């Protein structure tokens, strides 16, 4: 994989024009099966039937393309996200064998993309305290960070002692 | 039915019109393409030698004015001490309206010798005659000069060559002088100092130093008082004082440039060809008599006294056949060979000829017109370019035929031959080849590897990032004169090599190179007519600015989008600073090398090895599409002197040292180019762009490196030939199951069926220590190319980055259907 | 690049003493631009002017140092965090014949630092259920893990059916 | 299926770039490697001839100062009585700042002749011209000398060669003298003793003995009073007393070194090349005119009188072509051949040419630059080294071409050719070979076996425990000059040939040879950085001490462990005397040969035939690792004269006798080396180390033995070639079921696929009587090599210990998949 991996989020979202069919994938990907597409919150499937989509650009640094079979209506929300599973993509012999820079590039590029997908979810889709806040720097102190399971009609509420977050029932 | 076949490359690149000639024994010994490689006499193919940058050709007497006209430069070699390996590369270059000689030794400019005797427009017509210890400078209209080295490398003198006695010729014999056959000559006496009187005007001032022969006597004229009176000194006594004109012989000096001294003479000119042969100096092809050569007195190179007609005296040879026989080259092979405008003149080497006045038997051998490029001697044969410059001719003596036989040495490789403009020879140390080199008008260089007794004759084509203009060399070494482009920053000189207009699908190709190159008032073309149209531009060298003049600007902003094509064939967007504001006003579009970081040469629709950029209109509505008058780019032409070397794998190389940040300076001659860096251990560490100031950054810091440009070798074997019992399978469907690449001392190889090739590894995991450079590798690599079933399919052996490369053969397992 | 990467959180916080200017960076970093500094919740700029800071020690396995131009007041909160981009712009040739220890160590080390920055955020700045809670082991069951967007004056509350978290409006 | 194939070796070692050339008839007639063997003109391959120690080159006039510079020694042979087999080996060696001639006969120094006429720095530029009964000593700057033998072996005289009449030359013709073309010469009279007066300064003192020609007359100058006046004796009468300068000819002596006698003359020098051809002496390549040769008067070798221009008089030949044609060698083959810097000059042997002044027909034959190494004549051809010294050229006349044809004799074996620095010929008695030998700069020797009419031409490479510096011989015998190392005890001179650092697994290789070799202030390297790290050191010869200088000592004892590599490839621990105390202080590390008893040459990661030692750090913690500045070993260089012989199977041999304890003394020239002992019956009994005092112990007591060093023969046949019906199968998977080794008169053979070889027995159980030596054996041995399935797999025929060896062929049964 002799491409360079740019610093681009592994998620993009669009509001469709009237009758739009083509949407750009700005982040790199290696397999068509590892790119998820939603339209108004409903995941689509690859194919040529109405309601499906085609995809191109695997292995490219960027500039992939999603082509809807059915043209989108105005203000349809199209979401495109990378979802490559984590695993080894190489195998090296213990006995004396050959090595190429393409082998190393393929391993490191795919591992960088996997890390970017984790960090994209962390940065865009998850909650965190502001980095400058005075949380405990010892992770064993779980007062601010561990959550309980919520029962029916319950919210997360710090208890009156200020020692941990507990599930709290709320009524009118 | 699987068949195992193999292919060697002894015969070089073969013309496509030979591809049905399975009867010849060359079908498995040649290549469809042999580019930037040579054929060794063992049959292997080796990457062509690289070059080392020496100097840039400038007018040193006019503030280092850059020379941009290849006709203003002409070089030649001069070996001064073969055992000490002292060979001088002398460059004749423009110096104002005159010439100068730049003398190079050890890749360094030693001294410059100027001369006002020659014009800058006469440079390409200056020939030399190299002796054991001096060089004669020859021009048909300028008296001979001597260039002789003094007591050091930097001490040189250019003087005039003055004969002891001039040669003589009777120009009335060819109708170029007054006919005196009806005149009567009267002598005052038969001996001593006399006066010769003519009944009619015959004498000119050029008759001073001439001869008068009649009645068995000879007299040398010493003064010409008028057209009818002259004073002469008797050399052999006359038998009488009355001489009939038709029985006499009056000859003037053969060489003369004086046409003003009374009585006025004709411009007879001076010899333009010459060679030193044994103990005589041979000079010929003067301005007035181009089909005549003169041999000096035996043992006295500067004496051409031809008063006597016997012995070791100086004499002349005239070449006549059917038509013009003007001498082109005088070759010191066997007994002297004379290539002319029509016929080759020589005598049989089986004849015991002592080379004297009445013991020379030069005869018209085969018909073989030749041009003014000097003939080459190598590998037991003589090679010379034909008169139309589209062929190289080989001359050898055939005892079975009793004469010299001339035949085209380019007979099997006519397709790659363009018009040839120079040639040289090279016998490099340690390399299994004898080389004949020849540059062409299109900027390429032919390479001919020959070993004729072993039936080795292989042609190949050499290309560079630039244009070869001359090749210099007589066997010991080889230099080239190359025209290259450099980035000149904010100024604009050159035009794009290619320019097309394309449709939204990027499939249409409408060539508009001429419109962009022409001035706005000669040609113009409308561009970006519709939304999503393209402008595709390409150039041999990288460029970082465009300068556009519009005959008609766009009515509104075209919303331009810019992309460049990288080495993987991927188009990538970049954002330049365009001062045209979407082709709405005349101006420049500029970008930095960081915007085009991945830019690399690539192929677009059969146009190979260009730096491509495409411009796409995004605006939906423009009322008036722009019309472009001219486009210029920020590159300019330069002319360089470079030395070819088999230890180099890049072009125009230079040894540099990087600092702690990897910064490298002093690469001004490579400004704007893409260069590779090779370590002293022999590892290519990558490529980078030199900016306009001659600086670049490399990966290795605090390292001594070699930096140069890539020339990409390409080897395409002959079509698969697997004759079965059914007959020749020349047109049968074939599929290559296995492809074997057999290589020696090679790195960075790749092979297979395009577009998806296979890289050949050169690192042994489990037996490699980090930081070391693996040596060049030897072995056999087996590949499944995954090609098609066509009878004439192409497989490629090439190199990903510069390095050593030698392919000794290609094998196949072919399913012949 | 021939350095070890130790197991150290990529974020450090200090309570400044009166007039303190030097604050230690205990974690490795490769470039000065990949370190973020906050003072009392305001991000500082690297430079020499007052109210700015200078930084040294890039490439060192044991971190470096932050030097404030203006001495800090007592109990000022200084937060330092590593924020390297997740990409790969330096790659190998297809058939390398020289692979340096620095290049190979660099590729492995930089990915370890990237993962440590992700893990530091999720260990110190993010919420999570306790590892022993009986959360659904099928990731497709999003009852406890998918959150809706909050409108004005709304909190996260498990619905009455106990099937998902929904936004619930609270006034006073 | 199974195919049976065979391989003989009459084409020698083939270049790896030929391995796809199955179309050539050489694929089954060559070898991949032919080392320390020669190819007989049958198909067989015989072990190379051994050498016998003669003497050590010393400066005998300065207290036997050992000579350690190969440029200070140059030998040549001189046959005095062929029928009595009296051939002298004369060695020119340094003697102070001058030279001396050491004359050897019957392996004994006969006498020494000193000479102050030559400098020690001019030795390599001294050439000889051996006559039937004397040798001329030629140098371009020193007058010719004669070396002639008196009435005994030890009686020799070195005198000056004085011509009766000197040759003359007009140097103004080549611009090296005053140009007199505008002068006027006045004679006092036309006959007898006259005075010649010039209108301008022309004469020099070197004109004494010169000639003046004009007006049909000739005069020999006898005195030069000034630059404008001279006295001469008229040889042929003049017709007048006023001679125009441009019609005259003034010549000075061609050879002269006097530049101080008034009026001062130029240093014209003396001839540097020569040969005796029939009844004339030919001398050429003087200092001033390098492209001219002079032939003496017919029948008078020391007379070069050239006053006359007809008959049997002395005369000159000047060689000119396109450029420098300085004469390199004058060959007495056919009708005389002249190799020059550029072109080969000769006349057709089919021409009935007597060698006289006006009927010599030397013409420029093929282009073929030559170096100063003298050409060799053998096997109906002429062989000479090219100018760049990377090729051997062969010249033969081709009647079909009408000229001499030059082609590379090394065309099929370019890989083993380094830079050649000497050559000789040998036609040994009783051996089916005609040998051309040539040593190289890298220290190897090329061996060329040729039988031209039978298409026998086989190259092979000869290596020794040392470096070949010169080879001497004209066919009757062969000597070599070899640089070898000896153990010098407690002193240190040489550096290690190889040095590496390695990791605990002993797989990493970090080359540090340059750091160990350089002085401490040039470069240094840190060693033993971590626990269990290694230092691997190797050397061509055994050594028993290291001397280490540290730029930075270790902070604490490194707990060093020492091991050496034996002949089985097994590392064994030994305990030296470590005066560095674990690299904590500068000092030496010494050991005895008993500590390294099993030490033998071996291979470590493609480096072959070295004595290896490794040092391992065992200390767990050291705060500061040592940095080594320089390492020296206790060996020193010596230069030996040795005679090659086909009766020897070892190098530098000497006949010795052991006492009752097996002790052998007098082997000082082999001090510190590993040597083998061979009995008179022809049985090799084992190996042992000679200590620094020249003593060693052998197994057989009270025995006369031959003692010398092993040079290991190696024969790797060509790749398997078994074409089938499918195709050439050059790249098919192949497996060798059976390997047949076909040998004649051989002992101690072993063959197979590395690393596990099979020994070939040479002792018949049941038909052997104890104490007897079984004679060299003849037969065929069949072996299952157990190799792999690769198409380029290698099989080796080699020898376990020195002895006779002749391999006449190798056969296979190959499963071709």
PDB file of N, CA and C in Angstrom, chain D residues 337-393:
ATOM      1  N   UNK D 337      54.436  -6.578 -35.376  1.00  0.00           N
ATOM      2  CA  UNK D 337      53.207  -5.919 -34.965  1.00  0.00           C
ATOM      3  C   UNK D 337      53.538  -4.837 -33.950  1.00  0.00           C
ATOM      4  N   UNK D 338      52.891  -3.685 -34.081  1.00  0.00           N
ATOM      5  CA  UNK D 338      53.079  -2.566 -33.164  1.00  0.00           C
ATOM      6  C   UNK D 338      51.759  -2.285 -32.463  1.00  0.00           C
ATOM      7  N   UNK D 339      51.694  -2.577 -31.170  1.00  0.00           N
ATOM      8  CA  UNK D 339      50.568  -2.154 -30.352  1.00  0.00           C
ATOM      9  C   UNK D 339      50.846  -0.745 -29.853  1.00  0.00           C
ATOM     10  N   UNK D 340      49.857   0.135 -29.973  1.00  0.00           N
ATOM     11  CA  UNK D 340      50.048   1.515 -29.547  1.00  0.00           C
ATOM     12  C   UNK D 340      48.970   1.934 -28.563  1.00  0.00           C
ATOM     13  N   UNK D 341      48.932   3.224 -28.236  1.00  0.00           N
ATOM     14  CA  UNK D 341      47.892   3.732 -27.354  1.00  0.00           C
ATOM     15  C   UNK D 341      46.512   3.615 -27.982  1.00  0.00           C
ATOM     16  N   UNK D 342      46.414   3.683 -29.309  1.00  0.00           N
ATOM     17  CA  UNK D 342      45.121   3.583 -29.976  1.00  0.00           C
ATOM     18  C   UNK D 342      45.037   2.415 -30.948  1.00  0.00           C
ATOM     19  N   UNK D 343      45.892   2.362 -31.958  1.00  0.00           N
ATOM     20  CA  UNK D 343      45.678   1.482 -33.092  1.00  0.00           C
ATOM     21  C   UNK D 343      46.808   0.471 -33.212  1.00  0.00           C
ATOM     22  N   UNK D 344      46.481  -0.693 -33.760  1.00  0.00           N
ATOM     23  CA  UNK D 344      47.465  -1.733 -34.018  1.00  0.00           C
ATOM     24  C   UNK D 344      47.979  -1.593 -35.443  1.00  0.00           C
ATOM     25  N   UNK D 345      49.295  -1.495 -35.595  1.00  0.00           N
ATOM     26  CA  UNK D 345      49.927  -1.290 -36.892  1.00  0.00           C
ATOM     27  C   UNK D 345      50.657  -2.554 -37.315  1.00  0.00           C
ATOM     28  N   UNK D 346      50.403  -2.997 -38.540  1.00  0.00           N
ATOM     29  CA  UNK D 346      51.028  -4.197 -39.074  1.00  0.00           C
ATOM     30  C   UNK D 346      50.861  -4.187 -40.583  1.00  0.00           C
ATOM     31  N   UNK D 347      51.601  -5.064 -41.247  1.00  0.00           N
ATOM     32  CA  UNK D 347      51.435  -5.278 -42.674  1.00  0.00           C
ATOM     33  C   UNK D 347      50.995  -6.711 -42.923  1.00  0.00           C
ATOM     34  N   UNK D 348      50.327  -6.912 -44.048  1.00  0.00           N
ATOM     35  CA  UNK D 348      49.767  -8.215 -44.361  1.00  0.00           C
ATOM     36  C   UNK D 348      50.878  -9.252 -44.467  1.00  0.00           C
ATOM     37  N   UNK D 349      50.766 -10.387 -43.778  1.00  0.00           N
ATOM     38  CA  UNK D 349      51.772 -11.444 -43.942  1.00  0.00           C
ATOM     39  C   UNK D 349      51.802 -12.027 -45.341  1.00  0.00           C
ATOM     40  N   UNK D 350      50.751 -11.822 -46.134  1.00  0.00           N
ATOM     41  CA  UNK D 350      50.718 -12.274 -47.517  1.00  0.00           C
ATOM     42  C   UNK D 350      51.514 -11.378 -48.456  1.00  0.00           C
ATOM     43  N   UNK D 351      52.015 -10.247 -47.977  1.00  0.00           N
ATOM     44  CA  UNK D 351      52.820  -9.341 -48.787  1.00  0.00           C
ATOM     45  C   UNK D 351      54.278  -9.772 -48.708  1.00  0.00           C
ATOM     46  N   UNK D 352      54.934  -9.853 -49.866  1.00  0.00           N
ATOM     47  CA  UNK D 352      56.345 -10.228 -49.949  1.00  0.00           C
ATOM     48  C   UNK D 352      57.185  -8.991 -49.654  1.00  0.00           C
ATOM     49  N   UNK D 353      57.260  -8.646 -48.373  1.00  0.00           N
ATOM     50  CA  UNK D 353      57.914  -7.412 -47.955  1.00  0.00           C
ATOM     51  C   UNK D 353      59.262  -7.692 -47.310  1.00  0.00           C
ATOM     52  N   UNK D 354      60.371  -7.292 -47.922  1.00  0.00           N
ATOM     53  CA  UNK D 354      61.629  -7.216 -47.181  1.00  0.00           C
ATOM     54  C   UNK D 354      61.623  -5.983 -46.299  1.00  0.00           C
ATOM     55  N   UNK D 355      62.254  -6.104 -45.137  1.00  0.00           N
ATOM     56  CA  UNK D 355      62.207  -5.031 -44.133  1.00  0.00           C
ATOM     57  C   UNK D 355      63.322  -4.061 -44.501  1.00  0.00           C
ATOM     58  N   UNK D 356      63.015  -3.168 -45.439  1.00  0.00           N
ATOM     59  CA  UNK D 356      63.932  -2.114 -45.846  1.00  0.00           C
ATOM     60  C   UNK D 356      63.178  -0.793 -45.902  1.00  0.00           C
ATOM     61  N   UNK D 357      63.907   0.270 -46.238  1.00  0.00           N
ATOM     62  CA  UNK D 357      63.449   1.621 -45.921  1.00  0.00           C
ATOM     63  C   UNK D 357      62.191   1.982 -46.706  1.00  0.00           C
ATOM     64  N   UNK D 358      62.169   1.698 -48.004  1.00  0.00           N
ATOM     65  CA  UNK D 358      61.094   2.198 -48.851  1.00  0.00           C
ATOM     66  C   UNK D 358      60.095   1.131 -49.271  1.00  0.00           C
ATOM     67  N   UNK D 359      60.148  -0.060 -48.690  1.00  0.00           N
ATOM     68  CA  UNK D 359      59.125  -1.060 -48.968  1.00  0.00           C
ATOM     69  C   UNK D 359      58.688  -1.747 -47.680  1.00  0.00           C
ATOM     70  N   UNK D 360      58.356  -0.949 -46.677  1.00  0.00           N
ATOM     71  CA  UNK D 360      57.576  -1.407 -45.535  1.00  0.00           C
ATOM     72  C   UNK D 360      56.169  -0.854 -45.690  1.00  0.00           C
ATOM     73  N   UNK D 361      55.178  -1.673 -45.363  1.00  0.00           N
ATOM     74  CA  UNK D 361      53.790  -1.333 -45.635  1.00  0.00           C
ATOM     75  C   UNK D 361      52.954  -1.402 -44.370  1.00  0.00           C
ATOM     76  N   UNK D 362      53.472  -0.870 -43.269  1.00  0.00           N
ATOM     77  CA  UNK D 362      52.715  -0.862 -42.026  1.00  0.00           C
ATOM     78  C   UNK D 362      51.515   0.061 -42.159  1.00  0.00           C
ATOM     79  N   UNK D 363      50.344  -0.456 -41.833  1.00  0.00           N
ATOM     80  CA  UNK D 363      49.091   0.267 -41.961  1.00  0.00           C
ATOM     81  C   UNK D 363      48.302   0.128 -40.673  1.00  0.00           C
ATOM     82  N   UNK D 364      47.433   1.079 -40.378  1.00  0.00           N
ATOM     83  CA  UNK D 364      46.588   0.950 -39.190  1.00  0.00           C
ATOM     84  C   UNK D 364      45.562  -0.156 -39.345  1.00  0.00           C
ATOM     85  N   UNK D 365      45.764  -1.262 -38.644  1.00  0.00           N
ATOM     86  CA  UNK D 365      44.754  -2.303 -38.551  1.00  0.00           C
ATOM     87  C   UNK D 365      43.715  -1.866 -37.528  1.00  0.00           C
ATOM     88  N   UNK D 366      42.934  -2.808 -37.015  1.00  0.00           N
ATOM     89  CA  UNK D 366      41.847  -2.523 -36.085  1.00  0.00           C
ATOM     90  C   UNK D 366      42.214  -1.576 -34.946  1.00  0.00           C
ATOM     91  N   UNK D 367      41.213  -0.877 -34.420  1.00  0.00           N
ATOM     92  CA  UNK D 367      41.372  -0.033 -33.244  1.00  0.00           C
ATOM     93  C   UNK D 367      41.427  -0.907 -31.996  1.00  0.00           C
ATOM     94  N   UNK D 368      42.522  -0.818 -31.248  1.00  0.00           N
ATOM     95  CA  UNK D 368      42.690  -1.678 -30.084  1.00  0.00           C
ATOM     96  C   UNK D 368      43.711  -1.096 -29.115  1.00  0.00           C
ATOM     97  N   UNK D 369      43.303  -0.191 -28.227  1.00  0.00           N
ATOM     98  CA  UNK D 369      44.263   0.430 -27.308  1.00  0.00           C
ATOM     99  C   UNK D 369      44.951  -0.597 -26.422  1.00  0.00           C
ATOM    100  N   UNK D 370      46.243  -0.383 -26.190  1.00  0.00           N
ATOM    101  CA  UNK D 370      47.071  -1.310 -25.436  1.00  0.00           C
ATOM    102  C   UNK D 370      47.799  -0.565 -24.328  1.00  0.00           C
ATOM    103  N   UNK D 371      48.166  -1.307 -23.288  1.00  0.00           N
ATOM    104  CA  UNK D 371      48.916  -0.773 -22.165  1.00  0.00           C
ATOM    105  C   UNK D 371      50.392  -1.144 -22.310  1.00  0.00           C
ATOM    106  N   UNK D 372      51.194  -0.734 -21.333  1.00  0.00           N
ATOM    107  CA  UNK D 372      52.640  -0.894 -21.405  1.00  0.00           C
ATOM    108  C   UNK D 372      53.115  -2.299 -21.057  1.00  0.00           C
ATOM    109  N   UNK D 373      52.223  -3.191 -20.630  1.00  0.00           N
ATOM    110  CA  UNK D 373      52.602  -4.575 -20.375  1.00  0.00           C
ATOM    111  C   UNK D 373      52.921  -5.258 -21.698  1.00  0.00           C
ATOM    112  N   UNK D 374      54.058  -5.945 -21.749  1.00  0.00           N
ATOM    113  CA  UNK D 374      54.551  -6.494 -23.005  1.00  0.00           C
ATOM    114  C   UNK D 374      53.637  -7.596 -23.528  1.00  0.00           C
ATOM    115  N   UNK D 375      53.386  -7.571 -24.833  1.00  0.00           N
ATOM    116  CA  UNK D 375      52.512  -8.554 -25.454  1.00  0.00           C
ATOM    117  C   UNK D 375      53.132  -9.945 -25.414  1.00  0.00           C
ATOM    118  N   UNK D 376      52.270 -10.952 -25.376  1.00  0.00           N
ATOM    119  CA  UNK D 376      52.669 -12.347 -25.311  1.00  0.00           C
ATOM    120  C   UNK D 376      52.342 -13.049 -26.620  1.00  0.00           C
ATOM    121  N   UNK D 377      53.203 -13.984 -27.003  1.00  0.00           N
ATOM    122  CA  UNK D 377      53.029 -14.774 -28.214  1.00  0.00           C
ATOM    123  C   UNK D 377      52.928 -16.238 -27.823  1.00  0.00           C
ATOM    124  N   UNK D 378      51.800 -16.863 -28.149  1.00  0.00           N
ATOM    125  CA  UNK D 378      51.569 -18.255 -27.786  1.00  0.00           C
ATOM    126  C   UNK D 378      50.393 -18.799 -28.583  1.00  0.00           C
ATOM    127  N   UNK D 379      50.470 -20.073 -28.968  1.00  0.00           N
ATOM    128  CA  UNK D 379      49.342 -20.788 -29.564  1.00  0.00           C
ATOM    129  C   UNK D 379      48.812 -20.065 -30.803  1.00  0.00           C
ATOM    130  N   UNK D 380      49.734 -19.696 -31.691  1.00  0.00           N
ATOM    131  CA  UNK D 380      49.406 -19.121 -32.995  1.00  0.00           C
ATOM    132  C   UNK D 380      48.611 -17.826 -32.883  1.00  0.00           C
ATOM    133  N   UNK D 381      48.861 -17.034 -31.846  1.00  0.00           N
ATOM    134  CA  UNK D 381      48.145 -15.778 -31.675  1.00  0.00           C
ATOM    135  C   UNK D 381      48.990 -14.842 -30.825  1.00  0.00           C
ATOM    136  N   UNK D 382      48.605 -13.571 -30.831  1.00  0.00           N
ATOM    137  CA  UNK D 382      49.219 -12.547 -30.000  1.00  0.00           C
ATOM    138  C   UNK D 382      48.198 -12.063 -28.981  1.00  0.00           C
ATOM    139  N   UNK D 383      48.594 -12.033 -27.713  1.00  0.00           N
ATOM    140  CA  UNK D 383      47.740 -11.579 -26.625  1.00  0.00           C
ATOM    141  C   UNK D 383      48.376 -10.367 -25.967  1.00  0.00           C
ATOM    142  N   UNK D 384      47.582  -9.327 -25.730  1.00  0.00           N
ATOM    143  CA  UNK D 384      48.089  -8.146 -25.051  1.00  0.00           C
ATOM    144  C   UNK D 384      46.983  -7.530 -24.211  1.00  0.00           C
ATOM    145  N   UNK D 385      47.378  -6.885 -23.125  1.00  0.00           N
ATOM    146  CA  UNK D 385      46.427  -6.261 -22.215  1.00  0.00           C
ATOM    147  C   UNK D 385      46.008  -4.909 -22.772  1.00  0.00           C
ATOM    148  N   UNK D 386      44.719  -4.596 -22.656  1.00  0.00           N
ATOM    149  CA  UNK D 386      44.189  -3.340 -23.158  1.00  0.00           C
ATOM    150  C   UNK D 386      44.682  -2.172 -22.306  1.00  0.00           C
ATOM    151  N   UNK D 387      44.444  -0.958 -22.806  1.00  0.00           N
ATOM    152  CA  UNK D 387      44.975   0.233 -22.150  1.00  0.00           C
ATOM    153  C   UNK D 387      44.375   0.433 -20.763  1.00  0.00           C
ATOM    154  N   UNK D 388      43.079   0.173 -20.599  1.00  0.00           N
ATOM    155  CA  UNK D 388      42.468   0.308 -19.282  1.00  0.00           C
ATOM    156  C   UNK D 388      42.723  -0.899 -18.389  1.00  0.00           C
ATOM    157  N   UNK D 389      43.382  -1.931 -18.913  1.00  0.00           N
ATOM    158  CA  UNK D 389      43.847  -3.090 -18.161  1.00  0.00           C
ATOM    159  C   UNK D 389      42.714  -3.964 -17.645  1.00  0.00           C
ATOM    160  N   UNK D 390      41.510  -3.829 -18.193  1.00  0.00           N
ATOM    161  CA  UNK D 390      40.385  -4.659 -17.788  1.00  0.00           C
ATOM    162  C   UNK D 390      40.056  -5.734 -18.812  1.00  0.00           C
ATOM    163  N   UNK D 391      40.864  -5.875 -19.858  1.00  0.00           N
ATOM    164  CA  UNK D 391      40.612  -6.865 -20.890  1.00  0.00           C
ATOM    165  C   UNK D 391      41.936  -7.374 -21.432  1.00  0.00           C
ATOM    166  N   UNK D 392      41.918  -8.604 -21.931  1.00  0.00           N
ATOM    167  CA  UNK D 392      43.013  -9.166 -22.709  1.00  0.00           C
ATOM    168  C   UNK D 392      42.542  -9.244 -24.150  1.00  0.00           C
ATOM    169  N   UNK D 393      43.317  -8.673 -25.059  1.00  0.00           N
ATOM    170  CA  UNK D 393      42.960  -8.628 -26.466  1.00  0.00           C
ATOM    171  C   UNK D 393      43.756  -9.665 -27.243  1.00  0.00           C
TER     172      UNK D 393
END
